[PDB]
Design a protein around this nucleic acid. Structure first.
Ligand SMILES: [Zn+2]
Length: 66
DNA sequence: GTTGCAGATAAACATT
DNA sequence: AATGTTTATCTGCAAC
């Protein structure tokens, strides 16, 4: 259900992963983690239109073993 | 057999 | 410079 889903905390409609807040308020992957760590609302000065991207860290993965 | 969704890690950025 | 802090991307599981 991304149709109309807007981050309740920061209104962004672009998110890498949609989270759900303890209140049931849709939030973007960033607000969910920041909010969970600090549990406070922050100004939208950290937001950008599209999503930010970065070089994929080392291909570290659950690779193997058992 | 494929898709979708949720959650967690590690890296890099900013600050001091 | 190191640490603290932050966010993007990866994978897995369940159901059909
Ligand atoms: Zn948000």
């Amino acid at each position: 259900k991304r149709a109309g889903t807007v981050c309740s905390n920061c209104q962004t409609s672009t998110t890498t992963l949609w989270r759900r807040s303890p209140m049931g308020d849709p939030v973007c992957n960033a607000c969910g983690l920041y909010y969970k760590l600090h549990q406070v609302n922050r100004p939208l000065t950290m937001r950008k239109d599209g999503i930010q991207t970065r070089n994929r860290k080392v291909s570290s993965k659950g690779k193997k073993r058992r």
